[PDB]
RNA sequence: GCGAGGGGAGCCCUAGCACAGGUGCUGCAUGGCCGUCGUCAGCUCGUGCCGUGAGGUGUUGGGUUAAGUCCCGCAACGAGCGCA
């Protein structure tokens, strides 16, 4: 059922902005718009969720992210409904890399709850 | 020591030694203090990111303000010397 749902209404959309690499992942390009390969997508989904199966059970944490409007809300509920980290708003430069200083802002957060109750 | 006479401290003259004192230089040897641009809106540090590097980014941009004042946006995130 996971396969036919995708085939339903969740594939192909972009046009005239394609990379040479995303081309081999393509199935066709009629009406002037690209059409992603559903078959290869499944196989990739398999390999991905395999990494998910390990990652989830390893106890590790996934950092979700999406600034696109169509994904801000979707990833929002789905990240909380899993307790996993995520950022829908404008991603900051250094969040992962310069993490030490980004955390200082998280520390400024607890200060708020202090003078909030 | 009853008296004579002797030495020391305080203080002086004369002779002699070490030394004092100098509004005599050098404000390009300096401390300190002061004028000045100008109360003008500025100048930087920490880490991250870009560049081979000098360095950039932040502090640029849009609105606003006496002001780097505040807001929104932002590969940047905070802080410090200033403004208040
Ligand atoms: Mg469905
Ligand atoms: Mg063409
Ligand atoms: Mg941002
Ligand atoms: Mg005598
Ligand atoms: Mg002399
Ligand atoms: Mg001088
Ligand atoms: Mg001087
Ligand atoms: Mg002179
Ligand atoms: Mg480098
Ligand atoms: Mg080179
Ligand atoms: Mg620099
Ligand atoms: Mg600069």
UniProtKB/Swiss-Prot annotation:
Protein task: Spans the head-body hinge region of the 30S subunit. Is loosely associated with the 30S subunit.
Subunit note: Part of the 30S ribosomal subunit. Contacts protein S8.
Domain of life: Bacteria
Similarity comment: Belongs to the universal ribosomal protein uS2 family.
Protein name in UniProt: Small ribosomal subunit protein uS2
Lineage of source species: Bacteria, Thermotogati, Deinococcota, Deinococci, Thermales
